[PDB]
């Protein structure tokens, strides 16, 4: 029932900034949109500001704000993400692409005034130069999953591990195995949850008027399983 929770009671403007380096291919992504945690709804448009994105847009979806999850009333006591606000949390992942390289990500998610900011550094190493990722062989598809969140008591945060299966152009699947850790930025109290799920549904589209490499994202995120 926090001061953190009340920051999400209306629609919140969102700013996303990503600095990326995958096998020395440097790139920046900026995103803008809004989130309505009451519905668990995100509407965002991302731009690669440096030119052509050197990896497929769908591989960056998970990296590019679980604080916008709709937690039902009976579950509000288990929403770590909002309870860490406004000071924020760091979200770290390693994403292992099966038979390919890995991303390591570190993001700070916090308010700057009334704007929820997700700022990310992403380092990708050991990719095949003509593999599914660097060779752009992945379809531009919806992504949906159910992520088991568990408390990490020692770290005063949360952890999660989950699989994303990206479809390759030939009908096969590129596995992206995600390991996630979140920890608060401030030293104030946070809510550590019982085990539960976050179910995410995404839709990816394009803006017919946008000449830059871009991704339009519509996302819905809902907590469950208590």
mmCIF file with all atom_site columns, C-alpha atoms in Angstrom:
data_model
loop_
_atom_site.group_PDB
_atom_site.id
_atom_site.type_symbol
_atom_site.label_atom_id
_atom_site.label_alt_id
_atom_site.label_comp_id
_atom_site.label_asym_id
_atom_site.label_entity_id
_atom_site.label_seq_id
_atom_site.pdbx_PDB_ins_code
_atom_site.Cartn_x
_atom_site.Cartn_y
_atom_site.Cartn_z
_atom_site.occupancy
_atom_site.B_iso_or_equiv
_atom_site.pdbx_formal_charge
_atom_site.auth_seq_id
_atom_site.auth_comp_id
_atom_site.auth_asym_id
_atom_site.auth_atom_id
_atom_site.pdbx_PDB_model_num
ATOM 1   C CA . UNK A 1 1   ? 0.000  0.000   0.000   1.00 0.00 ? 1   UNK A CA 1
ATOM 2   C CA . UNK A 1 2   ? 3.182  2.071   -0.262  1.00 0.00 ? 2   UNK A CA 1
ATOM 3   C CA . UNK A 1 3   ? 4.144  5.573   -1.214  1.00 0.00 ? 3   UNK A CA 1
ATOM 4   C CA . UNK A 1 4   ? 5.698  3.515   -4.098  1.00 0.00 ? 4   UNK A CA 1
ATOM 5   C CA . UNK A 1 5   ? 2.327  2.070   -5.176  1.00 0.00 ? 5   UNK A CA 1
ATOM 6   C CA . UNK A 1 6   ? 0.637  5.564   -5.333  1.00 0.00 ? 6   UNK A CA 1
ATOM 7   C CA . UNK A 1 7   ? 3.197  6.676   -7.913  1.00 0.00 ? 7   UNK A CA 1
ATOM 8   C CA . UNK A 1 8   ? 1.538  4.251   -10.358 1.00 0.00 ? 8   UNK A CA 1
ATOM 9   C CA . UNK A 1 9   ? -2.146 5.101   -9.880  1.00 0.00 ? 9   UNK A CA 1
ATOM 10  C CA . UNK A 1 10  ? -2.475 7.032   -13.157 1.00 0.00 ? 10  UNK A CA 1
ATOM 11  C CA . UNK A 1 11  ? -0.696 6.902   -16.518 1.00 0.00 ? 11  UNK A CA 1
ATOM 12  C CA . UNK A 1 12  ? 3.069  7.414   -16.171 1.00 0.00 ? 12  UNK A CA 1
ATOM 13  C CA . UNK A 1 13  ? 5.376  8.696   -18.997 1.00 0.00 ? 13  UNK A CA 1
ATOM 14  C CA . UNK A 1 14  ? 8.225  6.310   -19.647 1.00 0.00 ? 14  UNK A CA 1
ATOM 15  C CA . UNK A 1 15  ? 11.745 6.961   -20.920 1.00 0.00 ? 15  UNK A CA 1
ATOM 16  C CA . UNK A 1 16  ? 13.981 4.062   -22.034 1.00 0.00 ? 16  UNK A CA 1
ATOM 17  C CA . UNK A 1 17  ? 17.712 4.474   -22.871 1.00 0.00 ? 17  UNK A CA 1
ATOM 18  C CA . UNK A 1 18  ? 19.947 1.608   -23.911 1.00 0.00 ? 18  UNK A CA 1
ATOM 19  C CA . UNK A 1 19  ? 23.635 1.684   -24.698 1.00 0.00 ? 19  UNK A CA 1
ATOM 20  C CA . UNK A 1 20  ? 24.637 -1.579  -26.410 1.00 0.00 ? 20  UNK A CA 1
ATOM 21  C CA . UNK A 1 21  ? 27.789 -3.304  -27.646 1.00 0.00 ? 21  UNK A CA 1
ATOM 22  C CA . UNK A 1 22  ? 27.383 -6.741  -29.227 1.00 0.00 ? 22  UNK A CA 1
ATOM 23  C CA . UNK A 1 23  ? 30.679 -8.287  -30.480 1.00 0.00 ? 23  UNK A CA 1
ATOM 24  C CA . UNK A 1 24  ? 32.015 -4.662  -30.808 1.00 0.00 ? 24  UNK A CA 1
ATOM 25  C CA . UNK A 1 25  ? 28.934 -3.536  -32.832 1.00 0.00 ? 25  UNK A CA 1
ATOM 26  C CA . UNK A 1 26  ? 27.906 -0.436  -30.862 1.00 0.00 ? 26  UNK A CA 1
ATOM 27  C CA . UNK A 1 27  ? 24.399 0.953   -30.855 1.00 0.00 ? 27  UNK A CA 1
ATOM 28  C CA . UNK A 1 28  ? 22.018 3.120   -28.877 1.00 0.00 ? 28  UNK A CA 1
ATOM 29  C CA . UNK A 1 29  ? 18.238 2.727   -28.481 1.00 0.00 ? 29  UNK A CA 1
ATOM 30  C CA . UNK A 1 30  ? 15.889 5.331   -27.085 1.00 0.00 ? 30  UNK A CA 1
ATOM 31  C CA . UNK A 1 31  ? 12.263 4.629   -26.189 1.00 0.00 ? 31  UNK A CA 1
ATOM 32  C CA . UNK A 1 32  ? 9.251  6.687   -25.229 1.00 0.00 ? 32  UNK A CA 1
ATOM 33  C CA . UNK A 1 33  ? 5.734  5.832   -24.142 1.00 0.00 ? 33  UNK A CA 1
ATOM 34  C CA . UNK A 1 34  ? 3.557  5.409   -21.126 1.00 0.00 ? 34  UNK A CA 1
ATOM 35  C CA . UNK A 1 35  ? 2.473  2.763   -18.636 1.00 0.00 ? 35  UNK A CA 1
ATOM 36  C CA . UNK A 1 36  ? -0.873 2.304   -16.845 1.00 0.00 ? 36  UNK A CA 1
ATOM 37  C CA . UNK A 1 37  ? -0.180 -0.181  -14.050 1.00 0.00 ? 37  UNK A CA 1
ATOM 38  C CA . UNK A 1 38  ? -3.906 -0.317  -13.230 1.00 0.00 ? 38  UNK A CA 1
ATOM 39  C CA . UNK A 1 39  ? -4.349 -2.267  -16.455 1.00 0.00 ? 39  UNK A CA 1
ATOM 40  C CA . UNK A 1 40  ? -0.726 -3.545  -16.623 1.00 0.00 ? 40  UNK A CA 1
ATOM 41  C CA . UNK A 1 41  ? -0.551 -1.779  -20.001 1.00 0.00 ? 41  UNK A CA 1
ATOM 42  C CA . UNK A 1 42  ? 2.609  -0.441  -21.778 1.00 0.00 ? 42  UNK A CA 1
ATOM 43  C CA . UNK A 1 43  ? 2.658  1.494   -25.060 1.00 0.00 ? 43  UNK A CA 1
ATOM 44  C CA . UNK A 1 44  ? 6.161  2.300   -26.277 1.00 0.00 ? 44  UNK A CA 1
ATOM 45  C CA . UNK A 1 45  ? 8.006  3.269   -29.420 1.00 0.00 ? 45  UNK A CA 1
ATOM 46  C CA . UNK A 1 46  ? 11.768 2.548   -29.662 1.00 0.00 ? 46  UNK A CA 1
ATOM 47  C CA . UNK A 1 47  ? 14.274 4.004   -32.130 1.00 0.00 ? 47  UNK A CA 1
ATOM 48  C CA . UNK A 1 48  ? 17.812 2.876   -32.890 1.00 0.00 ? 48  UNK A CA 1
ATOM 49  C CA . UNK A 1 49  ? 19.395 6.352   -32.855 1.00 0.00 ? 49  UNK A CA 1
ATOM 50  C CA . UNK A 1 50  ? 22.789 5.183   -34.191 1.00 0.00 ? 50  UNK A CA 1
ATOM 51  C CA . UNK A 1 51  ? 21.401 3.708   -37.383 1.00 0.00 ? 51  UNK A CA 1
ATOM 52  C CA . UNK A 1 52  ? 20.703 0.095   -38.199 1.00 0.00 ? 52  UNK A CA 1
ATOM 53  C CA . UNK A 1 53  ? 20.201 -2.133  -35.137 1.00 0.00 ? 53  UNK A CA 1
ATOM 54  C CA . UNK A 1 54  ? 22.886 -4.858  -35.312 1.00 0.00 ? 54  UNK A CA 1
ATOM 55  C CA . UNK A 1 55  ? 20.710 -7.442  -33.529 1.00 0.00 ? 55  UNK A CA 1
ATOM 56  C CA . UNK A 1 56  ? 17.011 -8.349  -34.076 1.00 0.00 ? 56  UNK A CA 1
ATOM 57  C CA . UNK A 1 57  ? 14.525 -6.120  -32.221 1.00 0.00 ? 57  UNK A CA 1
ATOM 58  C CA . UNK A 1 58  ? 12.749 -9.132  -30.574 1.00 0.00 ? 58  UNK A CA 1
ATOM 59  C CA . UNK A 1 59  ? 16.023 -10.093 -28.709 1.00 0.00 ? 59  UNK A CA 1
ATOM 60  C CA . UNK A 1 60  ? 15.922 -6.720  -26.880 1.00 0.00 ? 60  UNK A CA 1
ATOM 61  C CA . UNK A 1 61  ? 12.229 -6.770  -25.861 1.00 0.00 ? 61  UNK A CA 1
ATOM 62  C CA . UNK A 1 62  ? 12.831 -8.284  -22.384 1.00 0.00 ? 62  UNK A CA 1
ATOM 63  C CA . UNK A 1 63  ? 15.707 -5.871  -21.674 1.00 0.00 ? 63  UNK A CA 1
ATOM 64  C CA . UNK A 1 64  ? 13.850 -2.741  -22.818 1.00 0.00 ? 64  UNK A CA 1
ATOM 65  C CA . UNK A 1 65  ? 9.669  -2.131  -16.534 1.00 0.00 ? 65  UNK A CA 1
ATOM 66  C CA . UNK A 1 66  ? 7.953  -4.801  -14.404 1.00 0.00 ? 66  UNK A CA 1
ATOM 67  C CA . UNK A 1 67  ? 6.932  -1.987  -12.055 1.00 0.00 ? 67  UNK A CA 1
ATOM 68  C CA . UNK A 1 68  ? 3.987  -1.532  -14.508 1.00 0.00 ? 68  UNK A CA 1
ATOM 69  C CA . UNK A 1 69  ? 2.604  -5.025  -13.767 1.00 0.00 ? 69  UNK A CA 1
ATOM 70  C CA . UNK A 1 70  ? -1.031 -5.251  -12.723 1.00 0.00 ? 70  UNK A CA 1
ATOM 71  C CA . UNK A 1 71  ? -0.935 -6.866  -9.267  1.00 0.00 ? 71  UNK A CA 1
ATOM 72  C CA . UNK A 1 72  ? -4.440 -7.856  -8.149  1.00 0.00 ? 72  UNK A CA 1
ATOM 73  C CA . UNK A 1 73  ? -5.580 -6.317  -4.796  1.00 0.00 ? 73  UNK A CA 1
ATOM 74  C CA . UNK A 1 74  ? -5.085 -9.629  -2.954  1.00 0.00 ? 74  UNK A CA 1
ATOM 75  C CA . UNK A 1 75  ? -1.461 -9.607  -4.172  1.00 0.00 ? 75  UNK A CA 1
ATOM 76  C CA . UNK A 1 76  ? -0.422 -5.966  -3.533  1.00 0.00 ? 76  UNK A CA 1
ATOM 77  C CA . UNK A 1 77  ? 1.764  -6.994  -0.617  1.00 0.00 ? 77  UNK A CA 1
ATOM 78  C CA . UNK A 1 78  ? 3.898  -8.982  -3.093  1.00 0.00 ? 78  UNK A CA 1
ATOM 79  C CA . UNK A 1 79  ? 4.779  -6.149  -5.547  1.00 0.00 ? 79  UNK A CA 1
ATOM 80  C CA . UNK A 1 80  ? 8.500  -5.565  -4.960  1.00 0.00 ? 80  UNK A CA 1
ATOM 81  C CA . UNK A 1 81  ? 8.892  -3.427  -8.100  1.00 0.00 ? 81  UNK A CA 1
ATOM 82  C CA . UNK A 1 82  ? 6.660  -0.586  -7.036  1.00 0.00 ? 82  UNK A CA 1
ATOM 83  C CA . UNK A 1 83  ? 7.776  -0.765  -3.368  1.00 0.00 ? 83  UNK A CA 1
ATOM 84  C CA . UNK A 1 84  ? 11.371 0.111   -4.405  1.00 0.00 ? 84  UNK A CA 1
ATOM 85  C CA . UNK A 1 85  ? 10.049 3.400   -5.980  1.00 0.00 ? 85  UNK A CA 1
ATOM 86  C CA . UNK A 1 86  ? 10.809 6.272   -6.411  1.00 0.00 ? 86  UNK A CA 1
ATOM 87  C CA . UNK A 1 87  ? 14.458 5.499   -5.577  1.00 0.00 ? 87  UNK A CA 1
ATOM 88  C CA . UNK A 1 88  ? 14.406 2.481   -7.932  1.00 0.00 ? 88  UNK A CA 1
ATOM 89  C CA . UNK A 1 89  ? 15.969 -0.918  -8.406  1.00 0.00 ? 89  UNK A CA 1
ATOM 90  C CA . UNK A 1 90  ? 18.779 -2.347  -10.506 1.00 0.00 ? 90  UNK A CA 1
ATOM 91  C CA . UNK A 1 91  ? 17.758 -5.186  -12.790 1.00 0.00 ? 91  UNK A CA 1
ATOM 92  C CA . UNK A 1 92  ? 20.570 -7.472  -14.019 1.00 0.00 ? 92  UNK A CA 1
ATOM 93  C CA . UNK A 1 93  ? 20.276 -10.256 -16.538 1.00 0.00 ? 93  UNK A CA 1
ATOM 94  C CA . UNK A 1 94  ? 22.405 -12.680 -18.362 1.00 0.00 ? 94  UNK A CA 1
ATOM 95  C CA . UNK A 1 95  ? 20.592 -13.909 -21.512 1.00 0.00 ? 95  UNK A CA 1
ATOM 96  C CA . UNK A 1 96  ? 22.172 -17.069 -22.988 1.00 0.00 ? 96  UNK A CA 1
ATOM 97  C CA . UNK A 1 97  ? 21.327 -17.621 -26.650 1.00 0.00 ? 97  UNK A CA 1
ATOM 98  C CA . UNK A 1 98  ? 21.509 -21.340 -27.166 1.00 0.00 ? 98  UNK A CA 1
ATOM 99  C CA . UNK A 1 99  ? 24.359 -22.225 -29.598 1.00 0.00 ? 99  UNK A CA 1
ATOM 100 C CA . UNK A 1 100 ? 25.232 -18.501 -29.843 1.00 0.00 ? 100 UNK A CA 1
ATOM 101 C CA . UNK A 1 101 ? 26.502 -15.703 -27.598 1.00 0.00 ? 101 UNK A CA 1
ATOM 102 C CA . UNK A 1 102 ? 25.159 -14.036 -24.513 1.00 0.00 ? 102 UNK A CA 1
ATOM 103 C CA . UNK A 1 103 ? 23.933 -10.595 -23.418 1.00 0.00 ? 103 UNK A CA 1
ATOM 104 C CA . UNK A 1 104 ? 24.730 -9.239  -20.003 1.00 0.00 ? 104 UNK A CA 1
ATOM 105 C CA . UNK A 1 105 ? 22.522 -6.337  -18.980 1.00 0.00 ? 105 UNK A CA 1
ATOM 106 C CA . UNK A 1 106 ? 22.484 -3.878  -16.063 1.00 0.00 ? 106 UNK A CA 1
ATOM 107 C CA . UNK A 1 107 ? 19.625 -1.403  -15.829 1.00 0.00 ? 107 UNK A CA 1
ATOM 108 C CA . UNK A 1 108 ? 18.615 1.252   -13.367 1.00 0.00 ? 108 UNK A CA 1
ATOM 109 C CA . UNK A 1 109 ? 14.860 1.668   -13.120 1.00 0.00 ? 109 UNK A CA 1
ATOM 110 C CA . UNK A 1 110 ? 13.731 4.729   -11.151 1.00 0.00 ? 110 UNK A CA 1
ATOM 111 C CA . UNK A 1 111 ? 11.712 7.988   -11.306 1.00 0.00 ? 111 UNK A CA 1
ATOM 112 C CA . UNK A 1 112 ? 13.219 11.229  -12.538 1.00 0.00 ? 112 UNK A CA 1
ATOM 113 C CA . UNK A 1 113 ? 10.477 13.538  -11.472 1.00 0.00 ? 113 UNK A CA 1
ATOM 114 C CA . UNK A 1 114 ? 7.200  12.188  -12.865 1.00 0.00 ? 114 UNK A CA 1
ATOM 115 C CA . UNK A 1 115 ? 8.971  10.091  -15.597 1.00 0.00 ? 115 UNK A CA 1
ATOM 116 C CA . UNK A 1 116 ? 9.761  6.429   -15.028 1.00 0.00 ? 116 UNK A CA 1
ATOM 117 C CA . UNK A 1 117 ? 13.209 5.887   -16.474 1.00 0.00 ? 117 UNK A CA 1
ATOM 118 C CA . UNK A 1 118 ? 14.706 2.548   -17.588 1.00 0.00 ? 118 UNK A CA 1
ATOM 119 C CA . UNK A 1 119 ? 18.403 3.095   -18.387 1.00 0.00 ? 119 UNK A CA 1
ATOM 120 C CA . UNK A 1 120 ? 20.319 0.068   -19.535 1.00 0.00 ? 120 UNK A CA 1
ATOM 121 C CA . UNK A 1 121 ? 23.822 -1.008  -20.432 1.00 0.00 ? 121 UNK A CA 1
ATOM 122 C CA . UNK A 1 122 ? 24.029 -4.153  -22.566 1.00 0.00 ? 122 UNK A CA 1
ATOM 123 C CA . UNK A 1 123 ? 27.150 -6.137  -23.427 1.00 0.00 ? 123 UNK A CA 1
ATOM 124 C CA . UNK A 1 124 ? 26.941 -9.022  -25.885 1.00 0.00 ? 124 UNK A CA 1
ATOM 125 C CA . UNK A 1 125 ? 29.919 -11.353 -26.506 1.00 0.00 ? 125 UNK A CA 1
ATOM 126 C CA . UNK A 1 126 ? 30.740 -14.635 -28.289 1.00 0.00 ? 126 UNK A CA 1
ATOM 127 C CA . UNK A 1 127 ? 28.097 -14.365 -31.016 1.00 0.00 ? 127 UNK A CA 1
ATOM 128 C CA . UNK A 1 128 ? 28.451 -15.953 -34.417 1.00 0.00 ? 128 UNK A CA 1
ATOM 129 C CA . UNK A 1 129 ? 28.906 -13.139 -36.971 1.00 0.00 ? 129 UNK A CA 1
ATOM 130 C CA . UNK A 1 130 ? 26.488 -14.910 -39.373 1.00 0.00 ? 130 UNK A CA 1
ATOM 131 C CA . UNK A 1 131 ? 24.314 -16.618 -36.712 1.00 0.00 ? 131 UNK A CA 1
ATOM 132 C CA . UNK A 1 132 ? 20.656 -16.039 -35.995 1.00 0.00 ? 132 UNK A CA 1
ATOM 133 C CA . UNK A 1 133 ? 21.276 -12.864 -34.003 1.00 0.00 ? 133 UNK A CA 1
ATOM 134 C CA . UNK A 1 134 ? 24.047 -11.015 -35.889 1.00 0.00 ? 134 UNK A CA 1
ATOM 135 C CA . UNK A 1 135 ? 22.798 -12.435 -39.197 1.00 0.00 ? 135 UNK A CA 1
ATOM 136 C CA . UNK A 1 136 ? 19.235 -11.236 -38.456 1.00 0.00 ? 136 UNK A CA 1
ATOM 137 C CA . UNK A 1 137 ? 17.466 -14.596 -39.012 1.00 0.00 ? 137 UNK A CA 1
ATOM 138 C CA . UNK A 1 138 ? 14.689 -14.128 -36.395 1.00 0.00 ? 138 UNK A CA 1
ATOM 139 C CA . UNK A 1 139 ? 11.089 -13.328 -37.202 1.00 0.00 ? 139 UNK A CA 1
ATOM 140 C CA . UNK A 1 140 ? 9.523  -10.055 -35.927 1.00 0.00 ? 140 UNK A CA 1
ATOM 141 C CA . UNK A 1 141 ? 6.913  -11.841 -33.738 1.00 0.00 ? 141 UNK A CA 1
ATOM 142 C CA . UNK A 1 142 ? 4.691  -11.433 -30.656 1.00 0.00 ? 142 UNK A CA 1
ATOM 143 C CA . UNK A 1 143 ? 6.417  -12.599 -27.405 1.00 0.00 ? 143 UNK A CA 1
ATOM 144 C CA . UNK A 1 144 ? 4.358  -13.989 -24.466 1.00 0.00 ? 144 UNK A CA 1
ATOM 145 C CA . UNK A 1 145 ? 5.411  -15.938 -21.339 1.00 0.00 ? 145 UNK A CA 1
ATOM 146 C CA . UNK A 1 146 ? 4.801  -16.572 -17.591 1.00 0.00 ? 146 UNK A CA 1
ATOM 147 C CA . UNK A 1 147 ? 7.778  -15.689 -15.410 1.00 0.00 ? 147 UNK A CA 1
ATOM 148 C CA . UNK A 1 148 ? 8.161  -17.271 -11.906 1.00 0.00 ? 148 UNK A CA 1
ATOM 149 C CA . UNK A 1 149 ? 9.350  -14.600 -9.533  1.00 0.00 ? 149 UNK A CA 1
ATOM 150 C CA . UNK A 1 150 ? 10.958 -15.633 -6.224  1.00 0.00 ? 150 UNK A CA 1
ATOM 151 C CA . UNK A 1 151 ? 12.377 -13.600 -3.320  1.00 0.00 ? 151 UNK A CA 1
ATOM 152 C CA . UNK A 1 152 ? 16.111 -13.324 -2.794  1.00 0.00 ? 152 UNK A CA 1
ATOM 153 C CA . UNK A 1 153 ? 16.168 -12.629 0.957   1.00 0.00 ? 153 UNK A CA 1
ATOM 154 C CA . UNK A 1 154 ? 19.968 -12.215 1.292   1.00 0.00 ? 154 UNK A CA 1
ATOM 155 C CA . UNK A 1 155 ? 19.970 -9.490  -1.422  1.00 0.00 ? 155 UNK A CA 1
ATOM 156 C CA . UNK A 1 156 ? 16.757 -7.814  -0.228  1.00 0.00 ? 156 UNK A CA 1
ATOM 157 C CA . UNK A 1 157 ? 15.379 -8.357  -3.757  1.00 0.00 ? 157 UNK A CA 1
ATOM 158 C CA . UNK A 1 158 ? 13.974 -10.751 -6.274  1.00 0.00 ? 158 UNK A CA 1
ATOM 159 C CA . UNK A 1 159 ? 15.250 -13.219 -8.850  1.00 0.00 ? 159 UNK A CA 1
ATOM 160 C CA . UNK A 1 160 ? 13.743 -14.933 -11.850 1.00 0.00 ? 160 UNK A CA 1
ATOM 161 C CA . UNK A 1 161 ? 14.750 -17.385 -14.551 1.00 0.00 ? 161 UNK A CA 1
ATOM 162 C CA . UNK A 1 162 ? 12.797 -18.058 -17.721 1.00 0.00 ? 162 UNK A CA 1
ATOM 163 C CA . UNK A 1 163 ? 13.017 -19.147 -21.369 1.00 0.00 ? 163 UNK A CA 1
ATOM 164 C CA . UNK A 1 164 ? 12.130 -17.095 -24.443 1.00 0.00 ? 164 UNK A CA 1
ATOM 165 C CA . UNK A 1 165 ? 11.789 -18.999 -27.702 1.00 0.00 ? 165 UNK A CA 1
ATOM 166 C CA . UNK A 1 166 ? 12.326 -16.771 -30.723 1.00 0.00 ? 166 UNK A CA 1
ATOM 167 C CA . UNK A 1 167 ? 11.163 -18.179 -34.037 1.00 0.00 ? 167 UNK A CA 1
ATOM 168 C CA . UNK A 1 168 ? 13.807 -18.406 -36.728 1.00 0.00 ? 168 UNK A CA 1
ATOM 169 C CA . UNK A 1 169 ? 12.883 -17.669 -40.397 1.00 0.00 ? 169 UNK A CA 1
ATOM 170 C CA . UNK A 1 170 ? 12.986 -21.424 -41.312 1.00 0.00 ? 170 UNK A CA 1
ATOM 171 C CA . UNK A 1 171 ? 10.402 -22.444 -38.667 1.00 0.00 ? 171 UNK A CA 1
ATOM 172 C CA . UNK A 1 172 ? 12.958 -23.448 -36.034 1.00 0.00 ? 172 UNK A CA 1
ATOM 173 C CA . UNK A 1 173 ? 13.485 -21.840 -32.587 1.00 0.00 ? 173 UNK A CA 1
ATOM 174 C CA . UNK A 1 174 ? 16.282 -19.774 -31.101 1.00 0.00 ? 174 UNK A CA 1
ATOM 175 C CA . UNK A 1 175 ? 16.279 -20.243 -27.301 1.00 0.00 ? 175 UNK A CA 1
ATOM 176 C CA . UNK A 1 176 ? 17.123 -17.279 -25.093 1.00 0.00 ? 176 UNK A CA 1
ATOM 177 C CA . UNK A 1 177 ? 17.635 -18.464 -21.530 1.00 0.00 ? 177 UNK A CA 1
ATOM 178 C CA . UNK A 1 178 ? 17.154 -15.572 -19.060 1.00 0.00 ? 178 UNK A CA 1
ATOM 179 C CA . UNK A 1 179 ? 18.614 -15.293 -15.536 1.00 0.00 ? 179 UNK A CA 1
ATOM 180 C CA . UNK A 1 180 ? 17.481 -12.166 -13.694 1.00 0.00 ? 180 UNK A CA 1
ATOM 181 C CA . UNK A 1 181 ? 18.306 -10.488 -10.343 1.00 0.00 ? 181 UNK A CA 1
ATOM 182 C CA . UNK A 1 182 ? 16.698 -7.298  -8.959  1.00 0.00 ? 182 UNK A CA 1
ATOM 183 C CA . UNK A 1 183 ? 17.926 -5.307  -5.950  1.00 0.00 ? 183 UNK A CA 1
ATOM 184 C CA . UNK A 1 184 ? 16.815 -1.970  -4.515  1.00 0.00 ? 184 UNK A CA 1
ATOM 185 C CA . UNK A 1 185 ? 18.829 1.200   -5.058  1.00 0.00 ? 185 UNK A CA 1
ATOM 186 C CA . UNK A 1 186 ? 17.759 2.900   -1.811  1.00 0.00 ? 186 UNK A CA 1
ATOM 187 C CA . UNK A 1 187 ? 18.246 1.641   1.768   1.00 0.00 ? 187 UNK A CA 1
ATOM 188 C CA . UNK A 1 188 ? 14.578 2.126   2.656   1.00 0.00 ? 188 UNK A CA 1
ATOM 189 C CA . UNK A 1 189 ? 12.223 -0.821  3.090   1.00 0.00 ? 189 UNK A CA 1
ATOM 190 C CA . UNK A 1 190 ? 10.793 -2.934  0.259   1.00 0.00 ? 190 UNK A CA 1
ATOM 191 C CA . UNK A 1 191 ? 8.223  -5.745  -0.006  1.00 0.00 ? 191 UNK A CA 1
ATOM 192 C CA . UNK A 1 192 ? 9.666  -9.177  -0.606  1.00 0.00 ? 192 UNK A CA 1
ATOM 193 C CA . UNK A 1 193 ? 7.130  -11.355 -2.351  1.00 0.00 ? 193 UNK A CA 1
ATOM 194 C CA . UNK A 1 194 ? 5.952  -14.919 -1.942  1.00 0.00 ? 194 UNK A CA 1
ATOM 195 C CA . UNK A 1 195 ? 6.601  -17.015 -5.120  1.00 0.00 ? 195 UNK A CA 1
ATOM 196 C CA . UNK A 1 196 ? 4.242  -15.927 -7.955  1.00 0.00 ? 196 UNK A CA 1
ATOM 197 C CA . UNK A 1 197 ? 4.067  -15.346 -11.729 1.00 0.00 ? 197 UNK A CA 1
ATOM 198 C CA . UNK A 1 198 ? 4.163  -12.392 -14.018 1.00 0.00 ? 198 UNK A CA 1
ATOM 199 C CA . UNK A 1 199 ? 2.399  -13.173 -17.246 1.00 0.00 ? 199 UNK A CA 1
ATOM 200 C CA . UNK A 1 200 ? 3.453  -10.953 -20.165 1.00 0.00 ? 200 UNK A CA 1
ATOM 201 C CA . UNK A 1 201 ? 1.842  -10.576 -23.613 1.00 0.00 ? 201 UNK A CA 1
ATOM 202 C CA . UNK A 1 202 ? 3.501  -8.416  -26.274 1.00 0.00 ? 202 UNK A CA 1
ATOM 203 C CA . UNK A 1 203 ? 2.678  -7.206  -29.781 1.00 0.00 ? 203 UNK A CA 1
ATOM 204 C CA . UNK A 1 204 ? 5.345  -5.802  -32.097 1.00 0.00 ? 204 UNK A CA 1
ATOM 205 C CA . UNK A 1 205 ? 4.530  -3.480  -35.013 1.00 0.00 ? 205 UNK A CA 1
ATOM 206 C CA . UNK A 1 206 ? 5.959  -0.727  -37.206 1.00 0.00 ? 206 UNK A CA 1
ATOM 207 C CA . UNK A 1 207 ? 5.130  2.977   -37.610 1.00 0.00 ? 207 UNK A CA 1
ATOM 208 C CA . UNK A 1 208 ? 4.435  3.516   -41.386 1.00 0.00 ? 208 UNK A CA 1
ATOM 209 C CA . UNK A 1 209 ? 5.824  7.082   -41.112 1.00 0.00 ? 209 UNK A CA 1
ATOM 210 C CA . UNK A 1 210 ? 9.146  6.178   -39.393 1.00 0.00 ? 210 UNK A CA 1
ATOM 211 C CA . UNK A 1 211 ? 12.267 5.897   -41.576 1.00 0.00 ? 211 UNK A CA 1
ATOM 212 C CA . UNK A 1 212 ? 14.642 5.027   -38.685 1.00 0.00 ? 212 UNK A CA 1
ATOM 213 C CA . UNK A 1 213 ? 15.077 1.443   -37.470 1.00 0.00 ? 213 UNK A CA 1
ATOM 214 C CA . UNK A 1 214 ? 12.356 1.143   -34.861 1.00 0.00 ? 214 UNK A CA 1
ATOM 215 C CA . UNK A 1 215 ? 9.952  -0.991  -32.919 1.00 0.00 ? 215 UNK A CA 1
ATOM 216 C CA . UNK A 1 216 ? 6.441  -0.224  -31.765 1.00 0.00 ? 216 UNK A CA 1
ATOM 217 C CA . UNK A 1 217 ? 5.570  -2.259  -28.652 1.00 0.00 ? 217 UNK A CA 1
ATOM 218 C CA . UNK A 1 218 ? 2.193  -2.917  -26.987 1.00 0.00 ? 218 UNK A CA 1
ATOM 219 C CA . UNK A 1 219 ? 2.584  -4.902  -23.781 1.00 0.00 ? 219 UNK A CA 1
ATOM 220 C CA . UNK A 1 220 ? 0.336  -6.256  -20.993 1.00 0.00 ? 220 UNK A CA 1
ATOM 221 C CA . UNK A 1 221 ? 1.782  -7.581  -17.730 1.00 0.00 ? 221 UNK A CA 1
ATOM 222 C CA . UNK A 1 222 ? -0.269 -9.261  -14.992 1.00 0.00 ? 222 UNK A CA 1
ATOM 223 C CA . UNK A 1 223 ? 0.771  -10.857 -11.675 1.00 0.00 ? 223 UNK A CA 1
ATOM 224 C CA . UNK A 1 224 ? -0.905 -14.137 -10.682 1.00 0.00 ? 224 UNK A CA 1
ATOM 225 C CA . UNK A 1 225 ? -0.574 -17.414 -8.923  1.00 0.00 ? 225 UNK A CA 1
ATOM 226 C CA . UNK A 1 226 ? -1.338 -16.531 -5.366  1.00 0.00 ? 226 UNK A CA 1
#
